[PDB]
Amino acid sequence: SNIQTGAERMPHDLSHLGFLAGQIGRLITISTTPVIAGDSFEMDAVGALRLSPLRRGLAIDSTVDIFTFYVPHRHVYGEQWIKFMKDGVNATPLPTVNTTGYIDHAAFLGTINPDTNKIPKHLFQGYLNIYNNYFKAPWMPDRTEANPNELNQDDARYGFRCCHLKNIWTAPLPPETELSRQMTTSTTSIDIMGLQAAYANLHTDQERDYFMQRYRDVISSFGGKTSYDADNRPLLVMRSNLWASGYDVDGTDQTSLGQFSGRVQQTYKHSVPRFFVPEHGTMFTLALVRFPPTATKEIQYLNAKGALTYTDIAGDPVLYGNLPPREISMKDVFRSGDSSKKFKIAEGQWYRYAPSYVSPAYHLLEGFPFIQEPPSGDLQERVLIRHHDYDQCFQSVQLLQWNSQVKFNVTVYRNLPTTRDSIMTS
Amino acid sequence: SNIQTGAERMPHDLSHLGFLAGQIGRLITISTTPVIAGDSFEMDAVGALRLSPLRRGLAIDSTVDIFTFYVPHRHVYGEQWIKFMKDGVNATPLPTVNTTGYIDHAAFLGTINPDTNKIPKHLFQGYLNIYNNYFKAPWMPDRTEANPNELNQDDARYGFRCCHLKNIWTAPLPPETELSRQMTTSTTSIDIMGLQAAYANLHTDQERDYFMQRYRDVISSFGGKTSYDADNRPLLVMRSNLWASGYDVDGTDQTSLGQFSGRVQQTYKHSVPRFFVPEHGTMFTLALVRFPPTATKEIQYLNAKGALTYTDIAGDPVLYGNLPPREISMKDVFRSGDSSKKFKIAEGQWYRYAPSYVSPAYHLLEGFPFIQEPPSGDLQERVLIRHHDYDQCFQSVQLLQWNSQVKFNVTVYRNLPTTRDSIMTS
Amino acid sequence: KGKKRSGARPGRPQPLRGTKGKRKGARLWYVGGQQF
Amino acid sequence: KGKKRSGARPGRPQPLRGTKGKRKGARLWYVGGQQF
DNA sequence: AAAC
DNA sequence: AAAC
DNA sequence: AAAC
DNA sequence: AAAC
């Protein structure tokens, strides 16, 4: 017998509908398309973004980010994948990670949990890589779970927590920033030349602390470049950002005349231009919905830290341009701030930033997506968004905090035989 | 104190002379330049290639290949390197491989052996990567030595053995090529549909055997591409190939009038166009000198394998286009061929190739670079060149079989401060 | 690599009308004949 | 990536004349003054 | 990483 | 029935 | 890897 | 002495 040895590349329509729902600061997978080496991929996601009904009228738009990343399988199975491709037909089948027995416990990967409880490891691992390289704060430790079953029900069902949009309190300098540096000197002399050197080393430290915690950044610093293969990072193909809005619904009965309900319907469109897939992998598309971090009790630093010194009030450039990072507490910027919770700020930061003001009349008023009490906890707990901080904002519904109905138009120019080349023996 | 935090990229002249010598089929390092992330590298190697004086006049030109590869350090220290860059100034110093106590025992890396006996592991490892990805036959096992001290004195001093230029005997199909394939059938029926499938699987096998033993090749087959980072391969930047020649010296004394000595002087030029170094690494430049594999006893297959069948003599395209690889012995193509040494050839190969003819009058005549007896040994020993097969060709000299005097013009556009920025405290 | 964001598609939402891509290609279903 | 070979530099060999590149740049040696 |  |  |  |  002679067999159908070739195939000619033709457009494959892998389009599908997406019925989505998530929480406010959690990263969730909304679509995934497995890709073959050599195919060309393009997508047009067009749908509507809705928030759960809110308790009063619209006050603030939320921002939406949609991302499409490419994760080669090699990146996920390493050596094992390489060998699989080489071994070919009799390669040992690929490893499968374990989920918790519930229908929504793999939802973070945008999938229904199979009854067996396992999924392809590349689906779980790709997600972790995406999170650890673009979403955790550079200084937090990577998420290193071996199987989805190690996750809480909120991480598993809704996706991992993302950081807030940058603030003085939301984006402090990295935890271990040094506020001083000693040079061991001799008892009655200092080496003028060693001192010089001392400064050169701290420099190098300081840069890694503030801008280069990641290997890829250290190289760019040298003016070199590093491939996504060099540090195994998911490649960001496309990203769309938008503000979702809508309209208020006027109540009209005897008791609710003078009352409104904000309806957020936002038409959006996520377009990924054609992309050449160099090796077999998954194409992950994720969504993140967030509100600006408006707390109902943030104070202006100068208004809440006692008596004002010359250094704090004068705006003297020689001072600000030359002294160490300032360690501050949650109490210097918040009404119920824990004085025990510290953070390092740049000197003069208070003159480079302005907090939003929420009159005290709004403090526990439901229907506003404001953070009601200052985040309590370690630096990490304060920068990671907590979806419950938004519970009193919406009407209670089964579709969490936001829901979307999208049409994923996706075309892949792949080269596999026709469905009938496939079902015909000859 | 304020320190010299920047530098401006300016041309660095890293030019140097090279006084070289090697054996005939061994790959040797002739120059190495350590590169920093972000520099631009360019080189103009211009010198003369000489062979040791030969015993009679010139008869055949040898061919010369000069190669320049780039090997990123990450490729060599992996994870350890990544961490080193991140750790910065207090990174743990990099590992150093061990050499044998002799002055020429690191010569294969184009260097004099330090008295301590160790060298940077990247220098030794880079060489192995280069060898294993472009020089061994795809089907031989990689060279996996941990330290240079595990090598024989000929590998260590002269470089590793390379394969001969392709021949019927020098380039047989890979050792494990299957000559048949069984499909387990039932006792009195065969599944017409399984058979079909059987053929699809063998196909996939066959391709990996003949053209895709390397992962990178399997992907190109899909029409995808793989970065040099994907499989860790040294990147080939430039390659020059040439035929070295010279002239005969006429003897003129009473006894040597009628006698000649071939003098091979070959001016050559190896030019590497500018190259952007993406990450810190070494730039390796190696030379390989080889002669076409002319044996003094190869016979034409049809003239040396008995009685001729229709399949062997007719050139019937339907036969050649359809039967398994033919297993042959060293005796079917050589006068003192070991009948016990087999090899798989393509059917009809004898009509696609013609051996060179050396009249028997030349058999043990010294001064001709001919292979005098057919290579004896396993497939691997026969394809790897053996420099001693050329000993009776040259006058015996201290500079081995070939010597070169080159001027490596190399310019690097790097960014490090000036030699005085460097020696001035302020 | 990723870039400009655009869900700013100014419009009232439209009910999802059809899960079949934008550009189709060869035939995918074989059921024995025509089936409406 | 590598390519065309060229040692075919048609010429009689010339003695190596000088180990100093093609394009130089800043000063490298400081010995206290001029030294021939 | 609004960088000698 | 994206068909020698 | 002179490839449906 | 590839120098504020």
Of the candidates A68, A4, A70, A140, the one whose C-alpha atom is nearest the C-alpha of residue A281 is A70
Identify the CA nearest to B117 among candidates B102, B135, B95: B102
Strand order in the sheet with B26-35: B160-161, B26-35, B281-290, B62-72, B235-244
Inter-residue contact B143 to B135 (CB < 8 Å): no
Q: Which of strand H's nucleotides are less than 7 A from any protein C-beta?
A: 1-3
Distance CA B30, CA B25 (A): 15
Residue B217: exposure state from Cβ atoms within 10 A (0-12, 13-18, ≥19): middle
Distance from CA of D6 to the nearest CA of B (A): 5
- In angstroms, the CA of B53 and the C1' of H1 are apart by 50
A215–B82 CB contact, under 8 Å: yes
Amino acid at B364: L
Structure tokens at B329: 């012995």
Distance in angstroms (rounded) separating the CA atoms of residues A154 and A232:
28
* Whole-angstrom distance, CA of residue C30 vs CA of residue A188: 93
Nucleotide nearest to A38 (CA to C1'): G3
Q: Are strands B235-244 and B265-276 parallel, antiparallel or unpaired?
A: unpaired
Nucleotides in chain G with any atom closer than 7 Å to protein CB: 1, 3-4
AA letter at A40 = S
**What structural domains does chain B harbor?**
1-426 (2.60.169.10)
Q: Which single residue is written with the structure tokens 């590598």?
A: D2
Strands (E), B14-56: 16-22, 26-35, 40-51
Task: Give the C-alpha separation, A232 to A264, whole Å.
Answer: 38
Across the strands, what pairs with B45? B270, B408
Q: Residue for token digits 């409104």?
A: A260
Give chain E positions with protein CB within 7 A.
1, 3-4
Q: What is the resolution in angstroms?
A: 3.0
CB < 7 A from strand H, the residues are: B 10-11, 418, 420-421, 424; D 25-27, 33-34
| Contact assignment for A411 to C27 by CB distance below 8 Å | no
Are residues B208 and A88 in contact, defined by beta-carbon separation less than 8 angstroms?
yes
Q: List the structure tokens of A173.
A: 């300098």
Residue B51, amino acid: L
CA distance B417 to chain D (A): 10
A296 Cβ partners below 8 Å, 6+ apart? Answer: A358, A360, A362, A363, A364, A370, A371, A372
SS (H, E, C) chain A: CCCCCCCCCEEEECCEEEEEEECCCEEEEEEEEEECCCCEEEEEEEEEEEECCECCCCCCCEEEEEEEEEEEHHHHHCHHHHHHHHHHHHCCCCCEEECCCCCCCCHHHCCCCCCCCEEEHHHHHHHHHHHHHHHCCCCCCCCCCCCHHHCCHHHHHHCEECECCCCCCCCCCCCCCCCCCCCCCCCCCCCHHHHHHHHHHHHHHHHHHHCCCCHHHHHHHHCCCCCCCCCCCCEEEEEEEEEECCEEEECCCCCCCCCEEEECEEEEEEEEEEEECCCCEEEEEEEEEECCCCECCECCHHHHCCCCCHHHHCCCHHHHCCCCCEEEECCCCECCCCCCCEEEECCCHHHCCCCCCCCHHHCCCCCCCCECCCCCCCHHHHHECCHHHHHHHECCCCCCCEEEEEEEEEEEEECCCCHHHHHCCC
Count how many Cα atoms sit within 13 Å of the Cα of residue B163 in the half-sphere of its side chain: 20
B373-399 as b/e, with b when 16 or more CB fall inside 10 Å?
ebbeeebeebbbbbbebbeebbeeeee
| C1' of nucleotide F1: residue with nearest CA | C33
Across the interface, whether the CB atoms of B213 and A82 are under 8 A apart is answered no
What's the 3-state SS for B84-98? HHHHHHHCCCCCEEE
Out of B17, B49, B68, closest to residue D7 by CB: B49
Q: Does residue B81 contact residue B97 with C-beta atoms inside 8 Å?
A: no
Distance in Å, residue B211 CA to nucleotide G2 C1'? 14
Cβ-Cβ contacts under 8 Å, C14 against chain A: 48, 267
One-letter amino acid of A45? A
Interface check for D19 against chain B (CB to CB < 8 A): the answer is yes
At residue B236, the 3 state secondary structure works out as strand
Q: Is the shortest CB-to-strand distance from A8 to strand G under 7 Å?
A: yes
Q: Does D31 touch chain B (CB under 8 A)?
A: no
Looking at the DSSP assignment, which residues form a beta bridge with residue B47? B268, B406
B350: Cβ contacts below 8 Å, ≥ 6 apart? B168, B300, B301, B302, B312
B3/A196 Cβ within 8 A: yes
Cβ neighbours for B269, distance < 8 A, ≥ 6 positions apart: B44, B45, B46, B240, D6, D7, D9
